[PDB]
Design a protein around this ligand. Structure first.
Ligand SMILES: CCCCCCCC/C=C\CCCCCCCC(=O)O[C@@H](COC(=O)CCCCCCCCCCCCCCC)COP(=O)([O-])OCC[N+](C)(C)C
Ligand SMILES: O=c1[nH]c2cc(C(F)(F)F)c(N3CCOCC3)cc2n(CP(=O)(O)O)c1=O
Ligand SMILES: O=c1[nH]c2cc(C(F)(F)F)c(N3CCOCC3)cc2n(CP(=O)(O)O)c1=O
Ligand SMILES: O=c1[nH]c2cc(C(F)(F)F)c(N3CCOCC3)cc2n(CP(=O)(O)O)c1=O
Lengths: 104, 155, 156, 403, 159
């Protein structure tokens, strides 16, 4: 299995009503959850959505080169696929490998 | 018929009233239907080529390509081209020559807008000569007493 | 005199109202100075303007750097509120997707005008040198072809 | 050894190509891109234009790549600094950069220019509802004036309709009401006519002073609904295949229309398409790639324009074969160029600075002309019609009274 | 005749109300001397003041012998007081200052003033250096190159 790292709140991924009633990834619904279902059928991954805890997208802190959030949760091996709106930028690119944009 | 005569007359008067002549270089840059040309080879064309200014580069990009040749071979030709163009041509020459042409020539042309760059004329002397300091003093003292402003206002 | 005056001033009203041009692009907003525009406090949009080397962009940054009130907004929720309360005085500069979400799935007090100034995108990033690095690039490229990436946007 | 392609705004041959030929002297947007990608990543590159002259594609039986894909899969050249629509097939055989330019299927229409003023244009300054309300207000006022002068006096219906009409057209009235209740009606109708005539004159002056042109169509969502304007693609390619493979409602409708429509709306080539748009009136709209449309609307005669957003987004890449050690040396440089604001500056210069026309110069450029007979003739027709009708009713009354 | 005249009056009045044109009451210093309805004052003592005393040009001698004998005191204690007086009086006061200071002032808030007419007499700003310095000739060339590169103009434009 694989663990996905999406951000918590946006127009993209949200908490559906009766969040306590539902369990697992099914408690969560949004655009980038509907997407991260489609990609499964094209790559075969059987996953379980796992939102970043810090709630930041991520940058190497000036004092300490420690990436935060999803781009952090990826580098340190905590979880693989970042099915969420990460802007394709140079600094993230030199550390992590993206895909082609799904939105511009 | 009477209503549409009065309305159209108001249209003429209003539109004629809100007309603005090309006053500065920025206005001539935004405007695009009259052509401006410099001398073929001089300190002003090389100015534009070497210039790195959004307005200036916009002009240079304009003057680089034009179906007629905007550049004029001779400054006498440049004056004639503007006169015959009936407002189409807008020469770009040094301020002193512009003020001489618009004044001591039949007033078909005029100078509008402040000069874009700065220059200066000096009574030069050969490097390391004995007529450097006294000539510098002579020019400065002449300018202080206006003997350079009385002379310019004359000729 | 009074009737001639009434007709003349009515014509003035109608003529002036007819030549109204709303702020449609970034250049028009740059030249005009009646409306104040403010980015977020800290983000990629402000750093863009600071690092911007375009005269029109620098003109905005020179304006946004110094203003009698703080044109900058601390939170994007605050930024939306400031524009609504300012009644045309505030013009937020946010990302295109959020702008299109706000003008659509929020009470239509605001709208998005003009094309976006810069470009960027959202990849579905994978850890460097991972085994599923390609069968995700292929997945995204097929989804965009069959429109499943464009049906979904038109939905939410 | 990098390929290219001959598209005019991207890689062009300058004047006197014989004197200036080869890598030493080329002009184009992609040329400057190659120069900058070498400045960031120093390497030996020689501009070798593709021999085939087209972009990649594979024949079903031949199963070979041709153009800038065949020149790359078969080691004929290093990379391809040219517009490649990133797609599934191409990616599966090459390694694509991050898109250095994003685009879509724009909509091309002829620039909206003032039409010939139609007959019956004189009643434009006031809406249709106002004209109808004026007619029925006149007929109501005359009836009420008649009833008032016939409770309490030559204001019969015929002789009161004439008074009301005379008072509206500013011509002097033959007679005037004498009672109080007739004078109230007279006064309020005088006020009404004064306001309406002032409003008509003022709004007509507004129409004549500042002209305001509107695009007939704004977006494809409304272009599908219109259907009075014919819109067409190229013959076959990304656009036609996209429309046939589409499944969204609006796009499926815009394809069902064009699949069954006569004459041949699909155009043989883009030059013929733009020529057809320019030649015809605003009844033809052309659906092409956003970049090509933006470029075209800048060159002379500047008779066209781009309307509406991009229908479907796809980007352009910098191809590189899979095993290349240069494969990862281009992603990072493209991202840095995009972030520095250099690629945008390059496109801005190459497209707007080298632009045949500018928007600001002709923004107002307002000039007013005398009202030609075409504007007015809609009232000359009514005048002569009224005269003919008057002679007709005169003869009818004469014939009826003779017997 | 009456139809044409009334139509002309209404149309021209509509033009007056629609688009408004503002004209500067005074254009140049020659016309300012000719008018003399507007009182124009300098700073009390300085180059911009001592210039008019030691001036023999026809117009300038008039513009001095006017302000030489006129009441009240047009001469202002300081440039801040002069700009305040110009802002206060609606149109009766015109101030004669250095061109650069005028251009700078008209850019600051509340932007209630403006500069009209050309420069009356030209001066220059330099970069002083003592006579024996080995830095004396290292600044002429730098200044000329800065001027020629379009950098000094860029600096003034920006700031
Ligand atoms: C000899 C007798 C009448 C003149 C006959 C005119 C024929 C020559 C003009 C031909 C022409 O241009 O047709 C035009 C006018 O066609 C008309 O019908 C004119 C209307 C006037 C008729 C009488 C008006 C009312 C009578 C008195 C009342 C008391 C076309 O007009 P249309 O068909 O209405 O189409 C609308 C045009 N539009 C699209 C620009 C709005
Ligand atoms: O990778 C990034 N992804 C981002 C995603 C979002 C959004 F999805 F829209 F929430 C936003 N917002 C747009 C502006 O209002 C606040 C939220 C910014 C993003 N930024 C720039 P940040 O402002 O520094 O986070 C990134 O760099
Ligand atoms: O990979 C491809 N890249 C392409 C790039 C371009 C352009 F960007 F314009 F250079 C164009 N044109 C569109 C119309 O203007 C002239 C040519 C076609 C391309 N096609 C063929 P398609 O399938 O019709 O898009 C490809 O296959
Ligand atoms: O060398 C001199 N350089 C000067 C430069 C300036 C200015 F450029 F403006 F800073 C001024 N001001 C004029 C009004 O605005 C504020 C002060 C005075 C100067 N003076 C005194 P002056 O003799 O009265 O001209 C000099 O002597």
């Amino acid at each position: 299995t694989a663990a996905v790292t999406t951000i918590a709140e946006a127009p993209y991924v949200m908490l559906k009503k009766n969040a306590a009633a539902a369990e697992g990834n099914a408690a969560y619904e949004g655009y980038c959850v509907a997407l991260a279902a489609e990609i499964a059928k094209h790559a075969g991954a059987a996953y379980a959505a796992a939102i970043v805890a810090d709630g930041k997208y991520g940058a190497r802190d000036a004092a300490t080169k420690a990436w935060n959030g999803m781009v952090g949760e990826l580098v340190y091996g905590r979880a693989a696929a970042a099915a969420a709106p990460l802007t394709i930028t140079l600094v993230r690119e030199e550390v992590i490998d993206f895909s082609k944009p799904f939105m511009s | 018929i009477i209503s549409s005569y009065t309305a159209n007359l108001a249209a003429f008067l209003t539109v004629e009233r809100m007309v603005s002549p090309i006053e500065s270089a920025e206005d001539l840059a935004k405007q695009t239907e009259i052509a401006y040309g410099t001398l073929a080879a001089g300190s002003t064309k090389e100015f534009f080529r070497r210039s790195k200014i959004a307005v200036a580069a916009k002009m240079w990009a304009y003057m680089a390509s034009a179906e007629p040749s905007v550049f004029a071979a001779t400054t006498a030709a440049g004056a004639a081209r503007v006169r015959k163009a009936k407002g189409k041509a807008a020469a770009l020459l040094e301020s002193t020559m512009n003020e001489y042409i618009e004044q001591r020539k039949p007033c078909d042309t005029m100078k509008v807008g402040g000069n874009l760059d700065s220059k200066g004329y000096g009574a030069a002397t050969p490097k390391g000569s004995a007529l450097r300091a006294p000539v510098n003093l002579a020019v400065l003292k002449l300018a202080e007493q206006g003997a350079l402003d009385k002379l310019k206002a004359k000729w | 005199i009074i009737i001639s005056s009434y007709t003349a001033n009515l014509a003035a009203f109608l003529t002036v109202e007819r030549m109204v041009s709303p702020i449609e692009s970034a250049e028009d907003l740059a030249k005009q100075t009646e409306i104040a525009y403010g980015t977020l406090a800290a983000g990629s949009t402000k750093e863009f303007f600071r690092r911007s080397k375009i005269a029109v962009a620098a003109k905005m940054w020179a304006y946004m750097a110094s203003a009698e009130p703080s044109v900058f907004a601390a939170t994007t929720a605050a930024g939306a509120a400031r524009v609504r309360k300012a009644k045309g005085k505030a013009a937020a500069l946010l990302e295109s997707t959020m702008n299109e979400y706000i003008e659509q799935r929020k009470p239509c007090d605001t709208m998005k005008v003009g094309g976006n100034l810069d470009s960027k995108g959202y990849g579905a990033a994978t850890p460097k040198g991972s085994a599923l690095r390609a069968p995700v690039n292929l997945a995204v490229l097929k989804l965009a072809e069959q429109g499943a990436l464009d049906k979904l946007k038109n939905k939410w | 050894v990098v390929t290219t392609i001959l598209e005019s705004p991207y890689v062009m041959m300058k004047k006197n190509h014989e004197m200036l030929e080869g890598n030493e002297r080329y002009e184009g947007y992609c040329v400057d891109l190659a120069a900058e990608i070498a400045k960031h990543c120093g390497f030996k590159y020689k501009l070798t234009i593709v021999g085939d002259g087209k972009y990649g594609a594979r024949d079903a039986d031949t199963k070979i790549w041709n153009g800038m894909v065949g020149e790359l899969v078969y080691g004929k050249a290093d990379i391809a600094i040219a517009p490649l629509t990133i797609t599934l097939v191409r990616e599966e055989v090459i390694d694509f950069s991050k898109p250095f330019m994003s685009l879509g299927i724009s909509i091309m229409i002829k620039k909206p220019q003032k039409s010939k003023p139609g007959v019956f244009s004189f009643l434009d300054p006031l809406a249709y509802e106002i004209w109808m309300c004026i007619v029925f207000a006149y007929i109501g006022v005359s009836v009420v004036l008649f009833l008032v002068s016939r409770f309490s006096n030559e204001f019969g219906i015929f002789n009161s309709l004439w008074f009301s009409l005379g008072a509206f057209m500013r011509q002097g009235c033959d007679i005037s009401p004498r009672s109080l209740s007739g004078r109230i009606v007279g006064g309020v109708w005088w006020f009404f006519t004064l306001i309406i005539i002032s409003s008509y004159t003022a709004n007509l002056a507004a129409f004549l002073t500042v002209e305001r042109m509107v695009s007939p169509i704004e977006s494809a969502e409304d272009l599908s609904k219109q259907t009075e304007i014919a819109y067409g693609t190229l013959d076959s390619g990304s656009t036609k295949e996209f429309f046939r493979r589409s499944k969204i409602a609006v796009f499926d409708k815009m394809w069902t229309y064009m699949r069954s429509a006569e004459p041949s709306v699909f155009v043989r080539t883009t030059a013929e398409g733009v020529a057809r748009v320019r030649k015809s009136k605003g009844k033809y709209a052309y659906l092409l790639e956003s970049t090509m449309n933006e470029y075209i609307e800048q060159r002379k005669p500047c008779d066209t324009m781009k309307v509406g957003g991009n229908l479907d987004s796809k980007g352009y890449g910098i191809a590189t074969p899979k095993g290349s050690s240069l494969g990862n040396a281009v992603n990072l440089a493209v991202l840095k160029l995009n972030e520095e604001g250099l690629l945008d500056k390059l496109k801005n210069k190459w497209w707007y600075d080298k632009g045949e026309c500018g928007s600001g110069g002709g923004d107002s450029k307002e000039k007013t002309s005398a009202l030609s007979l075409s504007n007015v003739a809609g009232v000359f027709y009514i005048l002569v019609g009224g005269l003919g009708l008057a002679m007709l009713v005169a003869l009818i009354e004469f014939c009826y009274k003779s017997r």
